[PDB]
Amino acid sequence: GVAGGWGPWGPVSPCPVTCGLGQTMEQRTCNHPVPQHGGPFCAGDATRTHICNTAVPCPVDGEWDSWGEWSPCIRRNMKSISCQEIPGQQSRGRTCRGRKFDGHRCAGQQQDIRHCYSIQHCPLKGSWSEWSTWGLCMPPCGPNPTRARQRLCTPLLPKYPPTVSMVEGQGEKNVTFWGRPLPRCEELQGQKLVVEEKRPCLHVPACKDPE
Template sequence: MGLSWLNQLHLLAVIWGLGGLETPAEAVLCYEIFDKTSGSCGELLGDGVSQEDCCLNLQYGFRLQKDAPCEACRPAAWSDWSPWTPCSVSCEEGTQQRSRTCYGQGDCEQGPRQWELKPCGLGACCPVMGGWSAWSAWTPCSVTCLKGVQTRERTCTNPAPECGGTCQGSKSETQSCDTRQVCPTHGNWGSWGPWGACSATCTPEGSGPKPRQQRRHQCNNPTPSSNPPGNQCPGSDHEFQTCAGLPFCPQDGNWGSWKPFSDCSVTCAVGRQVEKRVCNSPAPKYGGKSCPGPDTRSLICNTQVPCPVDGHWSEWSDWSDCTRHTFQGKIECQEIPGFQRRNRRCIGRAHDGKRCPGDQLELRNCYNVKSCLMPGTWTDWSPWDLCEPACGQNPMRSRKRECKPNYPNYLMNIPGTGKVTNTSFWGKPLPVCEPLEKQRLRVLEKAPCQNVLPCTD
């Protein structure tokens, strides 16, 4: 069973240091984000924060050590259900699983973890493999001289696959082919020789350009063939250029001092504060290197103020009995309207958090049909229920048909308006149906779940 709200408040008081205990604060790794689905931490704030300060915001999470699991600051609550796993089979009938986990301080109802298992089916038939046709003829060689490749293909039609099946193996093959013909060789220049050296690699403004020259090697990379004849090398075998436009010599940059760039990111609990620096001491010039490293950094900041916790509604109470105190006599099984009420509580609000929106009390008119005999009608078969047990041997599924009462066509007038609202019937009537499979109220059918997935932990 989960902790009562009073016990949860006591637990939070211990966490927040309100219980009067003078135990030493334990340093934890504090995170801005606790993922309610996966139970993981994100956005590390710092590793020198006490658990008490970290949990001033109940939306935060923490780790006791670097490799320890993430824990939520909030009171214990169930995570959302995980997505259903893929069906255990690709055809006919199998099963799917989903789970949820209890995260937070304290315990959730129904144990630390809960599973659900349901039947599934992804196709009415299973794949049937096909067979290959005979290979086609080889294509012509891909080149007209020297060696190339040629291919051939086949189709998955002998027989064709069924229900999503395929053929094993490749639909094409490739082999080399030799034309036994010599290709012509075209001439190409050898590599350029080195430029003559300039007097400097960088220069101050005002220096004049200086000439340098390079030449090509002979037309021998490769030499053009004579039979069959190849083309000669194009263009000139030499080239000139000057050393004009040499760049100024580079000057590397250096960081200035760190300066505050923002206030603390939060007004409660623990947050971040950003500092910034500028690469201007000096700034880089003429292609010099920029300053290494980031220009901003985050520091942890602690407001020492607990964050507001908004209130949330408890579950509605059951509707009260349908009664009419001003009426002398019984209203059961008659077209005499009565009245009902139900209420709920606003729980969990702390540190000036928002109050619960909406009404705390609901009223409605009703007709009392408790234990009243009524003609009934058998429902159609319900959908199949989840497989039970979700983690265990031989899970079963079930569906049912039920004898449901045919409620009378009573109307409910709203006094003073002339309007008619929906009728509310209260109490469990006694429906009367013709027997079905020797049953008068419910017919139940059970079947085993097929291809059951094993539980992971």
């Protein structure tokens, strides 16, 4: 017919990605209807750049989550090694999260193991620390923020070797103190373990999301 009218847009070439979206050139044809007998041709662009969607998910590689807490310091042949110069062992783990659609696995250790001495509930001589620096104002956004500092009854750690060779063959593994001991100090301000002072924060600005 005389009238020109564009047909539908369509890709020129296959989407140049194997997953997700990509950009491709697209085109359309003046054939809906075809101009004929000198009638006007379709006005406008015959081509454009445009998103193409494969609709196929891309691989997603796994990533480690954060390590969990160390397990209790223990030695497999013994009921309790607390408060003795006996290395035990301890471990913690983490999990590979998010792997999907043939993404890579997480590389590295799933479990971390170390040697340790247990001072869990051990009495130890204590001394009062000097004041810590003031902490953050808490709650940061809630009514009336306050910040704190502390003096702590700090235990004297027993003077064991920091490294030990478990095997006759040479090899000095670190050994780390683990557990909450029971430090002994005379009281300060009526307290045996922590003395704390607090101060309001002043002219607190509001928490507004910049967004």
